[PDB]
Short mmCIF file of C-alpha atoms in Angstrom, two decimals:
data_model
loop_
_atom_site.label_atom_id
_atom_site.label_comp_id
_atom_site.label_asym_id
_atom_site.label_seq_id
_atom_site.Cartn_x
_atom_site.Cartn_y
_atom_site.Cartn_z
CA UNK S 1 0.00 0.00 0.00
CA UNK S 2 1.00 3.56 -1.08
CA UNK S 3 1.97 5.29 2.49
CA UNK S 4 -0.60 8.31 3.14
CA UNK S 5 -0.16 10.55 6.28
CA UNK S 6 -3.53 12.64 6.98
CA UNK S 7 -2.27 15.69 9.29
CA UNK S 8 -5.59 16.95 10.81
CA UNK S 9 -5.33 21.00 12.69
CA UNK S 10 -8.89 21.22 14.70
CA UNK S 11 -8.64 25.42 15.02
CA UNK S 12 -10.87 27.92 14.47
CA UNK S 13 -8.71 31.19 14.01
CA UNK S 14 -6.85 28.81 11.99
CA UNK S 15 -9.79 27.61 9.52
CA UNK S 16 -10.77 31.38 8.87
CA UNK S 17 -6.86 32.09 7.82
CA UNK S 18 -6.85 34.43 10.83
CA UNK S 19 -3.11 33.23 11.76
CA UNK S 20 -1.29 30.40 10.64
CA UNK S 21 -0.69 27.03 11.65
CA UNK S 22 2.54 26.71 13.04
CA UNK S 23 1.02 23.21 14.43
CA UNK S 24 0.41 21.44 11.86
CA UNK S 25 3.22 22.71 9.76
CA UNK S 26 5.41 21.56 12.78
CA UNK S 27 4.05 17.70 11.66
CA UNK S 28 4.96 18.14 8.39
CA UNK S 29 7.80 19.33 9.05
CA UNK S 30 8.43 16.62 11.71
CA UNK S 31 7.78 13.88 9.10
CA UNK S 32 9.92 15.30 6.16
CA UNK S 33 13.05 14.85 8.99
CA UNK S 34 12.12 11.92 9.87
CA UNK S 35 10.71 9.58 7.83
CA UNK S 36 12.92 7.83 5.12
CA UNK S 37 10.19 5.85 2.99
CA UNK S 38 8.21 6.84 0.75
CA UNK S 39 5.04 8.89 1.58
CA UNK S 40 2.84 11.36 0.97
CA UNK S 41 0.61 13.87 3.26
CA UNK S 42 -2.88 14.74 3.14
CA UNK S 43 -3.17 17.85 4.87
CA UNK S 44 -6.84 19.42 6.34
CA UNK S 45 -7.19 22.39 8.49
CA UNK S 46 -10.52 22.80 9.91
CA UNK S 47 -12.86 24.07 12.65
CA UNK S 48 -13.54 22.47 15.66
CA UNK S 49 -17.31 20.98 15.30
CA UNK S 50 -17.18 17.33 16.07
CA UNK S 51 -19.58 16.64 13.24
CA UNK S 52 -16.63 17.78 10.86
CA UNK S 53 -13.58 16.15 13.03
CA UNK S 54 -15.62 12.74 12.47
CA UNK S 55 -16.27 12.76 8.97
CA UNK S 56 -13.03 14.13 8.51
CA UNK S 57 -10.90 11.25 10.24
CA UNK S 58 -12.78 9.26 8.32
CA UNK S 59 -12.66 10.91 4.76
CA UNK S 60 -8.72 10.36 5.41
CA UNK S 61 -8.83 6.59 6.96
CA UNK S 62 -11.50 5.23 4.43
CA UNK S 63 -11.27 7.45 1.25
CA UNK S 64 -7.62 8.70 0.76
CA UNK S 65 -6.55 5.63 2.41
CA UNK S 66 -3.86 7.08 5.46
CA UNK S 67 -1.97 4.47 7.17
CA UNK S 68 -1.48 7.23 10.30
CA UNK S 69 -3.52 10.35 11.00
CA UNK S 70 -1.96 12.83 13.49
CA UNK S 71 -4.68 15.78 15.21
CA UNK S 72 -3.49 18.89 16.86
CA UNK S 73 -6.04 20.41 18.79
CA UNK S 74 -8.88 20.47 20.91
CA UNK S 75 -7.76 18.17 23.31
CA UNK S 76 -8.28 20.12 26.55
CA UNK S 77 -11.02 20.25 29.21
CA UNK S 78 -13.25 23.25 27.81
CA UNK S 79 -16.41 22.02 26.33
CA UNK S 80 -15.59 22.71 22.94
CA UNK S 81 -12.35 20.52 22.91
CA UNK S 82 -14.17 17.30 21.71
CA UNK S 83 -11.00 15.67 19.38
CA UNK S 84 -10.71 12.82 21.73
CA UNK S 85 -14.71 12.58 21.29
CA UNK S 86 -14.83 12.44 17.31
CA UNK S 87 -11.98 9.98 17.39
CA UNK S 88 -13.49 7.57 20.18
CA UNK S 89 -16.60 7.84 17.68
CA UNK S 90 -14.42 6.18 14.64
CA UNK S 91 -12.30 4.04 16.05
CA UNK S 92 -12.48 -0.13 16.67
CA UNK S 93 -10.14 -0.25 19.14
CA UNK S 94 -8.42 2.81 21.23
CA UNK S 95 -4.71 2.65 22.79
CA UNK S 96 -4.46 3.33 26.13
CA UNK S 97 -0.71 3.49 25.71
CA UNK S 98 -0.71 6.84 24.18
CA UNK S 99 -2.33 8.78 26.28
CA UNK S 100 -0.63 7.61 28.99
CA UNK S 101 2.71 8.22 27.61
CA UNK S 102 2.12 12.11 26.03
CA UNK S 103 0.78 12.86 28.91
CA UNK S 104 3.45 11.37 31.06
CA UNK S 105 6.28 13.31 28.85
CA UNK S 106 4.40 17.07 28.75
CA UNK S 107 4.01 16.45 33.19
CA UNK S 108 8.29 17.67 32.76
CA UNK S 109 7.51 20.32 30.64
CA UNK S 110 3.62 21.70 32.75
CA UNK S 111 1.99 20.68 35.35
CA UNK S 112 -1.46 21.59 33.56
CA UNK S 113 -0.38 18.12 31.23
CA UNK S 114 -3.16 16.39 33.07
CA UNK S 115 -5.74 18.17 31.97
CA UNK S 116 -4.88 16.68 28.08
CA UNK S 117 -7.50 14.12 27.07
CA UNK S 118 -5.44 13.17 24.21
CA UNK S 119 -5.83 9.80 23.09
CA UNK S 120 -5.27 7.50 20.29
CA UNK S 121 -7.06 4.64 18.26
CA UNK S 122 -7.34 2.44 15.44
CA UNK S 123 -9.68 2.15 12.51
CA UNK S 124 -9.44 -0.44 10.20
CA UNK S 125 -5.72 -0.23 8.73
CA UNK S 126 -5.20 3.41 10.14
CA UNK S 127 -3.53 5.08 13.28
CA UNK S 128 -5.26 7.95 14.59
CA UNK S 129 -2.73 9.95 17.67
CA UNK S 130 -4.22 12.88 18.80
CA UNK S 131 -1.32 16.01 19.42
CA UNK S 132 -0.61 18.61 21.07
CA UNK S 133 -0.82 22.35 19.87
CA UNK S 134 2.55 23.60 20.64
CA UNK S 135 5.07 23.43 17.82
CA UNK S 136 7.94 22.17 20.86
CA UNK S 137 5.35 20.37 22.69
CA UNK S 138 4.32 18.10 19.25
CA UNK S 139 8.07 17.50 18.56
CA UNK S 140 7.99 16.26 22.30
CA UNK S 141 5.17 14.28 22.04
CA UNK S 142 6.42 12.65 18.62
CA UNK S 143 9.89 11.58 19.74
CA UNK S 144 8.03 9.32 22.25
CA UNK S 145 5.93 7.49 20.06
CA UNK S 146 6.80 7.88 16.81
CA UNK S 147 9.30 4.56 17.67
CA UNK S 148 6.12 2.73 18.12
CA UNK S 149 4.26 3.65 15.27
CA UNK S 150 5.43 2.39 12.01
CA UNK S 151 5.10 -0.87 14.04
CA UNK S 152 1.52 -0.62 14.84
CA UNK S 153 0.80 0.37 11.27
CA UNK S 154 2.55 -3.12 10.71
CA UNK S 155 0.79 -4.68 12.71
CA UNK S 156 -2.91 -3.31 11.64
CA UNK S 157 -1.84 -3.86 8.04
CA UNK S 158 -1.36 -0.50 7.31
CA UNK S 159 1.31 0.69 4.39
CA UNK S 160 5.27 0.54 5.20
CA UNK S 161 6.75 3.20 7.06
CA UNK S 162 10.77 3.69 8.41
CA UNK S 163 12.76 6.47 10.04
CA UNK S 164 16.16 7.76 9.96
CA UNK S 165 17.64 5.54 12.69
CA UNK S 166 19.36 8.68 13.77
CA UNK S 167 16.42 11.21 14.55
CA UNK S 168 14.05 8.40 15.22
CA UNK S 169 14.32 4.85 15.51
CA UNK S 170 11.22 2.66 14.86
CA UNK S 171 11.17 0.01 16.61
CA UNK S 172 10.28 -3.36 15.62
CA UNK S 173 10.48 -6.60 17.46
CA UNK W 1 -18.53 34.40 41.15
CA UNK W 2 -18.22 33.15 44.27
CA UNK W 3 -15.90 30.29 44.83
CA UNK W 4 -17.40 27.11 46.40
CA UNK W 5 -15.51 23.65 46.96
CA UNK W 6 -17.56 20.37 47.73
CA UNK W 7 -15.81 18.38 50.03
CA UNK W 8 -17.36 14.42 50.51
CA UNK W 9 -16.84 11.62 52.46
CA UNK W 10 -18.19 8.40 51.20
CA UNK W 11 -18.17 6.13 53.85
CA UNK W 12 -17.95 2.16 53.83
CA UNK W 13 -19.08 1.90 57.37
CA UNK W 14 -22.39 4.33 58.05
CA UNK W 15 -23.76 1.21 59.44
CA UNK W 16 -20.67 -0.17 61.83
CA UNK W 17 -20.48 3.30 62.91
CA UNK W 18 -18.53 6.41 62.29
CA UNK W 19 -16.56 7.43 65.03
CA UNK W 20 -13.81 9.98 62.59
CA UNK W 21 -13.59 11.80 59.36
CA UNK W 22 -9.87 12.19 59.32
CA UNK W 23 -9.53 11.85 55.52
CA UNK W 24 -11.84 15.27 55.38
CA UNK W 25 -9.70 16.61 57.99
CA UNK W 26 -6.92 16.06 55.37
CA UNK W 27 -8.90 17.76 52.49
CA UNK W 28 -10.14 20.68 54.64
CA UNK W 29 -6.90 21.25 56.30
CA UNK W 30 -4.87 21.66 52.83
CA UNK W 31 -7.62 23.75 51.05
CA UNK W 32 -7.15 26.20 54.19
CA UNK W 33 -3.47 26.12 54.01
CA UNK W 34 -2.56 26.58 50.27
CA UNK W 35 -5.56 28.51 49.17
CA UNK W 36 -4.95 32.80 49.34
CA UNK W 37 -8.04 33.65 47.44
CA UNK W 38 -11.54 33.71 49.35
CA UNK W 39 -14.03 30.75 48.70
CA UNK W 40 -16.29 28.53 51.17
CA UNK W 41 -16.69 24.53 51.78
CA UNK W 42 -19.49 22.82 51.46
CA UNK W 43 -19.06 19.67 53.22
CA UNK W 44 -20.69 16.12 53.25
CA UNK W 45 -20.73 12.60 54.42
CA UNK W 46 -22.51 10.15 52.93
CA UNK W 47 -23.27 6.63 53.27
CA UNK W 48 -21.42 4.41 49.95
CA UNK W 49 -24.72 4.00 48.27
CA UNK W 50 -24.03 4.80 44.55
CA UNK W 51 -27.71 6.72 43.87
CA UNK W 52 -27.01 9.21 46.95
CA UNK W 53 -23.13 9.83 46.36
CA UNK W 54 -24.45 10.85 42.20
CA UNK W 55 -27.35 12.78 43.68
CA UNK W 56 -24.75 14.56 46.68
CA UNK W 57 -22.62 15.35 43.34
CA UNK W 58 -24.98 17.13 41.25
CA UNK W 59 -26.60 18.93 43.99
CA UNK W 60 -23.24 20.32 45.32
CA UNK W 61 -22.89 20.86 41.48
CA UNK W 62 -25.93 22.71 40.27
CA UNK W 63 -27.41 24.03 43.45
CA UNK W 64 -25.03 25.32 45.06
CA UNK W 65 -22.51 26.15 42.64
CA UNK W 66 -19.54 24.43 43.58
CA UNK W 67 -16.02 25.05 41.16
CA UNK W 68 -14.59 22.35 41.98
CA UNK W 69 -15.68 19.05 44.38
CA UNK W 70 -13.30 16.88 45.99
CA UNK W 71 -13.98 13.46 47.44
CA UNK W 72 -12.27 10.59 49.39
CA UNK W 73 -13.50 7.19 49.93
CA UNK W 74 -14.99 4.15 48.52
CA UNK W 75 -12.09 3.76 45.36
CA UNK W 76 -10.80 0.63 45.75
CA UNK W 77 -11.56 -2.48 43.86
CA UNK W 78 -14.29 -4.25 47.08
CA UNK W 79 -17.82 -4.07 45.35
CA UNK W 80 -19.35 -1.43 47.38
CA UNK W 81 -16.60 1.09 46.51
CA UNK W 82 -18.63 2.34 43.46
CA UNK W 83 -17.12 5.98 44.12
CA UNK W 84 -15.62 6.37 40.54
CA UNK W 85 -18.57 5.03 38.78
CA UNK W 86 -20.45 7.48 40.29
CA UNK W 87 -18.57 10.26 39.38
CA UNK W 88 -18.25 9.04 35.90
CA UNK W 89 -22.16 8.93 36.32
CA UNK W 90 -22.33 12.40 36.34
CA UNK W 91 -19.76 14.15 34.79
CA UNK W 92 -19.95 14.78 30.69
CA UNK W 93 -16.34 14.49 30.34
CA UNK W 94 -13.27 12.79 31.73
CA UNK W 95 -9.91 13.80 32.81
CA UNK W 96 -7.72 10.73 32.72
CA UNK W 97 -4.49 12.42 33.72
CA UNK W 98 -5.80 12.65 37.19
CA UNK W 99 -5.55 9.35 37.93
CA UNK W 100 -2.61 8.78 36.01
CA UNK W 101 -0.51 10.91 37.78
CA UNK W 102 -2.33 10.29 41.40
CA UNK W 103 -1.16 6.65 40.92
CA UNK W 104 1.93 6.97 39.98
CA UNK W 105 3.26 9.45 42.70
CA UNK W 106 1.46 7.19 45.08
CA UNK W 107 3.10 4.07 44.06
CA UNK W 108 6.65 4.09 45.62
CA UNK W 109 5.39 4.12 49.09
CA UNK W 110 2.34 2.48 48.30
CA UNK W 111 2.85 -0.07 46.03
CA UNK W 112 -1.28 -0.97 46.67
CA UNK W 113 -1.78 2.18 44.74
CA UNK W 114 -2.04 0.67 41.27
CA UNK W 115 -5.84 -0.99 43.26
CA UNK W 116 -7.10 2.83 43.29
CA UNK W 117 -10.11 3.27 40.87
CA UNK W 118 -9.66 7.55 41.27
CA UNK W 119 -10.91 9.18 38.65
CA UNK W 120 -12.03 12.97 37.78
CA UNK W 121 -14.49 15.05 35.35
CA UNK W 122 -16.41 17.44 34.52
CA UNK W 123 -19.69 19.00 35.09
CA UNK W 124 -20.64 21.93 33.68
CA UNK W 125 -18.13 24.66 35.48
CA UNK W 126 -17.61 22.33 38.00
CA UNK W 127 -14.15 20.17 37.99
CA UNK W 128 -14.31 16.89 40.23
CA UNK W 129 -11.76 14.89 41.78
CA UNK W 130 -11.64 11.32 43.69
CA UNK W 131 -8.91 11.66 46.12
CA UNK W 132 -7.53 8.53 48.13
CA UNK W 133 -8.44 8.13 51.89
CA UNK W 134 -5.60 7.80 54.09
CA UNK W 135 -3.96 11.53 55.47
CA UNK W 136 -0.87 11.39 53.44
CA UNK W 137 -1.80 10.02 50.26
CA UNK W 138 -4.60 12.48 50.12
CA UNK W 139 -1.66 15.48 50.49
CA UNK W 140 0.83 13.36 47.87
CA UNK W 141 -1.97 13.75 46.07
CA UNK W 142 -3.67 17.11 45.95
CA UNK W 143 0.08 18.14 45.84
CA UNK W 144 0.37 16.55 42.55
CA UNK W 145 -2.49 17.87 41.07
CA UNK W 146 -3.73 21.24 42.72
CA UNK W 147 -0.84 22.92 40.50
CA UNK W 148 -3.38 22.74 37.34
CA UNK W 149 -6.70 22.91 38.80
CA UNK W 150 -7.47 26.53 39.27
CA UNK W 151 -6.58 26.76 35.48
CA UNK W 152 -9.38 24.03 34.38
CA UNK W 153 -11.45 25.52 36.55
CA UNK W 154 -10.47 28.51 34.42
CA UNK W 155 -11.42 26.49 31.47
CA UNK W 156 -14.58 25.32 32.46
CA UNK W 157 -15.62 28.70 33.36
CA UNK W 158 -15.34 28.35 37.34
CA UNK W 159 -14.85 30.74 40.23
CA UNK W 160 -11.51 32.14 40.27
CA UNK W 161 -9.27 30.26 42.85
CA UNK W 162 -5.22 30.86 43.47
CA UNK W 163 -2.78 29.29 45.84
CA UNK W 164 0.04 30.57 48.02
CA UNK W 165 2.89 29.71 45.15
CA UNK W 166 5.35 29.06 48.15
CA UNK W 167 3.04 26.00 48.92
CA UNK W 168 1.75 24.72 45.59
CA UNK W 169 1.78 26.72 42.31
CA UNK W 170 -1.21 27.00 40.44
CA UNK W 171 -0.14 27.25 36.62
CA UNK W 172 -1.87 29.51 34.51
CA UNK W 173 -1.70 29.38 31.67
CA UNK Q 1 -10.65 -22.01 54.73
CA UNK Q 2 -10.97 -21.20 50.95
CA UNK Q 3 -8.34 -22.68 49.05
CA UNK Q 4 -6.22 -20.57 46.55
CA UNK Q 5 -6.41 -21.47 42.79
CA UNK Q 6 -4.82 -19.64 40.45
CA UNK Q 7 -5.66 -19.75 36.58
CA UNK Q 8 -3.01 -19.44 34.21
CA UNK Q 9 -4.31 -18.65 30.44
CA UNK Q 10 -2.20 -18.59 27.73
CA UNK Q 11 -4.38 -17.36 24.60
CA UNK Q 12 -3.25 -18.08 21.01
CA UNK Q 13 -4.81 -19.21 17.30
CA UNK Q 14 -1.22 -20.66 17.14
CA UNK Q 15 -0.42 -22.40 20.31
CA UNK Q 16 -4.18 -23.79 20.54
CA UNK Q 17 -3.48 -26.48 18.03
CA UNK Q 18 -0.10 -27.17 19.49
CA UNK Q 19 3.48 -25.82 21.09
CA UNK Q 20 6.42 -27.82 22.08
CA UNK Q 21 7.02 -25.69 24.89
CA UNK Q 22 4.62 -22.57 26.32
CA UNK Q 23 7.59 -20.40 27.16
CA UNK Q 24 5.28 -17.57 28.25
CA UNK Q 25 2.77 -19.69 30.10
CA UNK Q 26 5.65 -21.83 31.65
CA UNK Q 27 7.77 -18.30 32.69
CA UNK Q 28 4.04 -16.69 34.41
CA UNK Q 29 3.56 -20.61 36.47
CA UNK Q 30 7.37 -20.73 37.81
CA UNK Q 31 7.22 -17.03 38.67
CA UNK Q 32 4.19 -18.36 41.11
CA UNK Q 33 5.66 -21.01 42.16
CA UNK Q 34 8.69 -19.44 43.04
CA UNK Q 35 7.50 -16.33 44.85
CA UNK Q 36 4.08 -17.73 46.55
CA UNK Q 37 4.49 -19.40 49.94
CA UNK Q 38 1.42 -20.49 50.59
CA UNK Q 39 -0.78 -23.65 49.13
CA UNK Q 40 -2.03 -23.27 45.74
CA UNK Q 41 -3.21 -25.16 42.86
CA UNK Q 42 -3.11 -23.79 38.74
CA UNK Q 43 -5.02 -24.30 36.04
CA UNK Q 44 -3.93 -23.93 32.80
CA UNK Q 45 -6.18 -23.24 29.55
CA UNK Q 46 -4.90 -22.78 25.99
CA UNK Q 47 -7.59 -21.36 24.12
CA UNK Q 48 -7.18 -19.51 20.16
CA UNK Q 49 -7.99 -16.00 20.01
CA UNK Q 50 -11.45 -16.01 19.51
CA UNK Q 51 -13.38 -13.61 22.19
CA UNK Q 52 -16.47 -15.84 22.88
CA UNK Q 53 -14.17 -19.06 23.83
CA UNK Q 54 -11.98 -16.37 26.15
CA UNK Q 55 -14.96 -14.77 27.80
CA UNK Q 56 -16.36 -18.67 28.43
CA UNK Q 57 -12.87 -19.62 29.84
CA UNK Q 58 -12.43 -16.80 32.45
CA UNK Q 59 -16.20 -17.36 33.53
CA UNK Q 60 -15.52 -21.19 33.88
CA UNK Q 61 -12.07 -20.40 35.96
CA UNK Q 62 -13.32 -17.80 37.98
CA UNK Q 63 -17.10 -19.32 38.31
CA UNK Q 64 -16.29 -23.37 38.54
CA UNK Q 65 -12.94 -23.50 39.14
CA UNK Q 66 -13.21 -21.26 42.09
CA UNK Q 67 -9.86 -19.46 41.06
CA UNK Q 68 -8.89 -15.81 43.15
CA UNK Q 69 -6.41 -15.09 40.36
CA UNK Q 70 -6.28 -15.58 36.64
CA UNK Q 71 -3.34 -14.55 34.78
CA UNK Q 72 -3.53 -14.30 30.95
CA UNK Q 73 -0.70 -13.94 28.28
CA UNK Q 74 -1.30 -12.96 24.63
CA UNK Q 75 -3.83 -11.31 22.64
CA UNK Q 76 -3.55 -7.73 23.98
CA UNK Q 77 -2.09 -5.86 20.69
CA UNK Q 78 -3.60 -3.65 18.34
CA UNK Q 79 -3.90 -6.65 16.03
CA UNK Q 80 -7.83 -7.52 14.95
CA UNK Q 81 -7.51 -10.82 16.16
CA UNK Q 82 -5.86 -9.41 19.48
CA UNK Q 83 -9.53 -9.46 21.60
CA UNK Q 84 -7.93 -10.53 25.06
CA UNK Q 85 -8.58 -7.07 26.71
CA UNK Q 86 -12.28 -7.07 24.88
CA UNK Q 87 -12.74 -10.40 26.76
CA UNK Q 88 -11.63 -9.90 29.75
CA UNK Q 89 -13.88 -6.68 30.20
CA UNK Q 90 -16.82 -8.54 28.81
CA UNK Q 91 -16.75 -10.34 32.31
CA UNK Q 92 -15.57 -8.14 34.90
CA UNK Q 93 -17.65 -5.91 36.48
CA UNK Q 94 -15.18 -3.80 37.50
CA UNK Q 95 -11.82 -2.67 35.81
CA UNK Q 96 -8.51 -1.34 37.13
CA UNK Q 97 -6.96 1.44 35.58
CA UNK Q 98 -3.92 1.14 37.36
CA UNK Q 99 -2.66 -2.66 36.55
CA UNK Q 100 -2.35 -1.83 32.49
CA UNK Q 101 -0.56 1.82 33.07
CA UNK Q 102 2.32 0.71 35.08
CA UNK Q 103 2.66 -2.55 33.34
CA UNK Q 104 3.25 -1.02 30.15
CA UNK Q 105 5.38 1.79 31.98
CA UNK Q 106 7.40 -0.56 33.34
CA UNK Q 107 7.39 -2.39 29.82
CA UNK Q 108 8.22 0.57 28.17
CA UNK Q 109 11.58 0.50 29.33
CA UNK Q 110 13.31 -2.03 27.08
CA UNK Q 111 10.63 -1.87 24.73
CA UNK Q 112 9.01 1.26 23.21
CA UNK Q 113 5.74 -0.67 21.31
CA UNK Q 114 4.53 -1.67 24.62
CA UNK Q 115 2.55 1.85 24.27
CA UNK Q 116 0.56 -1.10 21.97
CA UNK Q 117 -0.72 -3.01 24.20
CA UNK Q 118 -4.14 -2.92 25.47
CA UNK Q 119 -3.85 -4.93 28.53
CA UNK Q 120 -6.54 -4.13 31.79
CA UNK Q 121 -7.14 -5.96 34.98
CA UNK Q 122 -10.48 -6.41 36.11
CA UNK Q 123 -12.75 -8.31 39.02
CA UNK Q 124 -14.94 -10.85 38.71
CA UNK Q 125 -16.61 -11.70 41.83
CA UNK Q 126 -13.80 -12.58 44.30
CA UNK Q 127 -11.21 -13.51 41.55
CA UNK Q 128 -9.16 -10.86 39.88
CA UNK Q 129 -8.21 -11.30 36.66
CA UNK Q 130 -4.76 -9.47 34.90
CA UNK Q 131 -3.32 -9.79 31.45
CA UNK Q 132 -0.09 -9.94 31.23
CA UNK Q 133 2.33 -9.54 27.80
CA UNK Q 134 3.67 -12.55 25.76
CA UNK Q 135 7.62 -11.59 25.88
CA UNK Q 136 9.32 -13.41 28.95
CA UNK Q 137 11.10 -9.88 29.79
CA UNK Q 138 8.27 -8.16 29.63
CA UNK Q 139 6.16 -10.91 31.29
CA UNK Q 140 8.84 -10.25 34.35
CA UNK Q 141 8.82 -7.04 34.87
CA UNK Q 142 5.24 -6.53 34.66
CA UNK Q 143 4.71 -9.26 37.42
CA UNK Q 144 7.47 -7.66 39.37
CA UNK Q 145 5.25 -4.45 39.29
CA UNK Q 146 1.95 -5.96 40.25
CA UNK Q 147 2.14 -8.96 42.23
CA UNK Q 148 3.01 -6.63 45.25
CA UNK Q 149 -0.55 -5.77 45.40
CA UNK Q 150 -2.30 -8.60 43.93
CA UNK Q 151 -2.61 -10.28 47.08
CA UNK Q 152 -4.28 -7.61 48.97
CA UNK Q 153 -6.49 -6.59 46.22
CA UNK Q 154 -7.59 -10.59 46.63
CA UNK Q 155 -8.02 -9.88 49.99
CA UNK Q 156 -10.52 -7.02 49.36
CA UNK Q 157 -12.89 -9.15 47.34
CA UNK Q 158 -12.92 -12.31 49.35
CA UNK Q 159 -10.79 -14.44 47.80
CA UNK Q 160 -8.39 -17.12 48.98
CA UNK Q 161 -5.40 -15.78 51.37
CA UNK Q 162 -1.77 -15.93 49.00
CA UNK Q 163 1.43 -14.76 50.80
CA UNK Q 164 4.70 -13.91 48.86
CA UNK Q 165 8.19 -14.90 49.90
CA UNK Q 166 9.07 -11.33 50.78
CA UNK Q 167 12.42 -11.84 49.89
CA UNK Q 168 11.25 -12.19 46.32
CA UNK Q 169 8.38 -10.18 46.54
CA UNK Q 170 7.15 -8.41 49.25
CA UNK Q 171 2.81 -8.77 49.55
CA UNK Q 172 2.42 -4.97 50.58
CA UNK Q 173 -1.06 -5.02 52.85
CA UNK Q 174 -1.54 -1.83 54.80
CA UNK Q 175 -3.11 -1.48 57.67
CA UNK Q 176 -5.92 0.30 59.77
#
């Protein structure tokens, strides 16, 4: 299978080209470094109404076929930061894993880290992690389980994805 | 405007007799100590029977306006300690880091920690937290996670509250 | 008096036809019988990764075989066919949160996929019931991290009394 990366930024200001998104870029950019197969990105920036995150996620998972989709934003306690919600609603199977470990690194960084409901989940042969919004905090967040990934993808039959053993190494038992 | 905190006691013996509330001691004492800003208690103790500890929730909730509610008892894995499923009962979302992190700055003296069910939501502008039972667990505790509650509370559009940072440091942002 | 049984389940499409050797069920049964000091009795189930035939196994353990503990091994990854954790909710009535984050904490150590695994604890009646991973490193350390308060959490539920050599591993049960 063709490797497909969605990179989903749930933001309003963002979706109305009020100021740009230095979050999702940060993915991207993230990727590019790392990544040393051959892949391509599908790239959506839009507001935060569930009813769009879901049919988004799975526009990406079941139409452009993405092995991996990565979300940045709305992940946080206020009522209108329902990501974890809309990807609960279209995955089979969620990770506990994730969660636990993002949150675990961002606790050096802020204290407020336990207030991130971030999660992560699996939908037929696609990985949906759900990011932070901070450009440092993503690249923090990705250097802890970005070595777990490509392996999952694996392991959900998912397309083929390695990393520059120096910047990243996937691991793979 | 006002700041109110909930304080209750779910107790697994209201029939072999309660002779001592020294885990709302604990609670009371530290909200005294750390907090500078003005706000009042509202205090219960309550029986472990799962309809009255949802129904104590969402009246200390929505009548009388509490930011943020704090319990201790009945978290452990015995049947009648149905503490956390009440809470899930009636809160509309989750915080998961909670008990993450209470469990694992509990564990090294309490290796029994990893048996705590402690959870904590949301309702409506109200954040609330399942604390542990003994005296210094619930301090390891609260000391863990007061740092980012007055900013959910924040979030979740709650009375303002602030600690004395040369006792615990509320983050904000 | 009630006497402690422990179930041992080793679940796998694989090994449920045949294996020479159950290295994983064989490393969780001499970790038991090395650490626990008190009288017990195993049983062992190998059973394919198929949900209903796990649910019906745990029930049977827990329900018939009167077990207080029931340690599984396999089945907990993000694989389709990996339904161990769907299972073992399915008869619990009660989950613990706690048991699957420091296991794959402590996992996570030599091994940065076990952010994979789904595995939970739960109880069912007076039995608890824990998955635990499939590689013998990881199977150690994960026991090394929860058997400390497995036998207290038995306690708690009513099931059979189990004591640790506490030169092993210590059976941490506080007090009041």
């Amino acid at each position: 299978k063709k490797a497909v990366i969605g990179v989903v930024t749930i933001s309003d200001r963002a979706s109305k080209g009020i100021y740009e998104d230095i979050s999702g870029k940060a993915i991207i950019d993230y990727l590019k470094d790392v990544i040393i197969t051959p892949f391509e990105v599908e790239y959506r920036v839009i507001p935060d109404e569930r009813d769009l995150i879901e049919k988004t996620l799975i526009e990406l998972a079941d139409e452009k076929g993405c092995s991996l989709i990565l979300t940045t934003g709305g992940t946080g306690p206020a009522p209108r930061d329902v990501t974890p919600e809309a990807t609960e609603a279209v995955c089979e199977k969620m990770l506990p894993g994730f969660g636990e470990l993002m949150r675990q690194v961002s606790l050096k960084q802020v204290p407020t880290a336990i207030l991130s409901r971030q999660t992560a989940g699996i939908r037929g042969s696609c990985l949906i992690v759900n990011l932070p919004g901070k450009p440092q905090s993503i690249k923090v967040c990705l250097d802890a389980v970005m070595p777990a990934i490509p392996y999952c993808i694996d392991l959900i039959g998912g397309a083929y994805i390695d990393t520059d053993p120096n910047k990243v190494k996937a691991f793979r038992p």
